Amino acid sequence: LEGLEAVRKRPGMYIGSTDKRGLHHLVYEIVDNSVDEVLNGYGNEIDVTINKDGSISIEDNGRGMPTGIHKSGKPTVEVIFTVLVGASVVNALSEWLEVEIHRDGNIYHQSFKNGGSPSSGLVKKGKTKKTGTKVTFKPDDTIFKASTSFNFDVLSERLQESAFLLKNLKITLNDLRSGKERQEHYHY
Numbered sequence: 001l002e003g004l005e006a007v008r009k010r011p012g013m014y015i016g017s018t019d020k021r022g023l024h025h026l027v028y029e030i031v032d033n034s035v036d037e038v039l040n041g042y043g044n045e046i047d048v049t050i051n052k053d054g055s056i057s058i059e060d061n062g063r064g065m066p067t068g069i070h071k072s073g074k075p076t077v078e079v080i081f082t083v084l085v086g087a088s089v090v091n092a093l094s095e096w097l098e099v100e101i102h103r104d105g106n107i108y109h110q111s112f113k114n115g116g117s118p119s120s121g122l123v124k125k126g127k128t129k130k131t132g133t134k135v136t137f138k139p140d141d142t143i144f145k146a147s148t149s150f151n152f153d154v155l156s157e158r159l160q161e162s163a164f165l166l167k168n169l170k171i172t173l174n175d176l177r178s179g180k181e182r183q184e185h186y187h188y
């Protein structure tokens with residue numbers, strides 16, 4: 001509704017602050033959704049990838065988000081990313097967000113743009129034998145005026161802590177950006 005605009009007006013009210021700590025909290029919110037699923041009993045691997053264009057991917061091997069109709073009459077995946085930390089907050093502060101779900105033998109995809117406005121509905125794009133959810137968002141430069149570039153070392157301390165706090169959970173962090181390519185993995 002106007003709820004996505006509200007986040008875009010006072011981001012600090014929803015995230016912790018409107019700085020580099022807030023920008024990295026967008027990533028932690030998406031990782032927390034995969035941790036929730038690990039704790040639900042499904043999944044043992046989380047992959048975080050900093051893409052060449054400055055977007056970030058968070059991939060898991062959980063069951064994959066449910067695709068049915070939510071109590072509001074609207075599809076579930078759409079509700080999660082558009083209704084008010086919450087994945088809707090990430091979506092509001094992103095110039096673009098994409099979801100990819102591997103569930104019930106199928107691959108579902110849904111795209112959002114310019115602050116969380118659905119660019120498409122949930123679309124069946126192929127078939128799979130793999131399960132899980134992959135979220136890829138690009139934070140908005142008009143919100144984080146100073147910077148939108150993720151810091152490998154900042155993400156790494158937090159993912160290390162999540163891997164230590166949970167146990168039997170392999171967290172991999174990757175950086176694809178030109179000249180600063182790095183790969184790390186954490187498992188306790």
Ligand SMILES: CO[C@@H]1[C@@H](OC(N)=O)[C@@H](O)[C@H](Oc2ccc3c(O)c(NC(=O)c4ccc(O)c(CC=C(C)C)c4)c(=O)oc3c2C)OC1(C)C
Pocket residue numbers: 032033034036037060062063064065066080087133
């Ligand atoms: C951002 O989405 C998050 C998820 O994030 C990720 N990465 O998976 C995750 O944190 C969590 O994921 C859930 C949260 C709830 C369910 C959930 O409620 C499910 N269903 C069952 O637990 C279930 C278990 C037994 C059973 O007989 C039925 C039948 C269903 C009926 C009668 C409606 C359903 C299910 O399959 O997957 C679920 C999943 C994957 O919640 C979201 C969707 C907000």
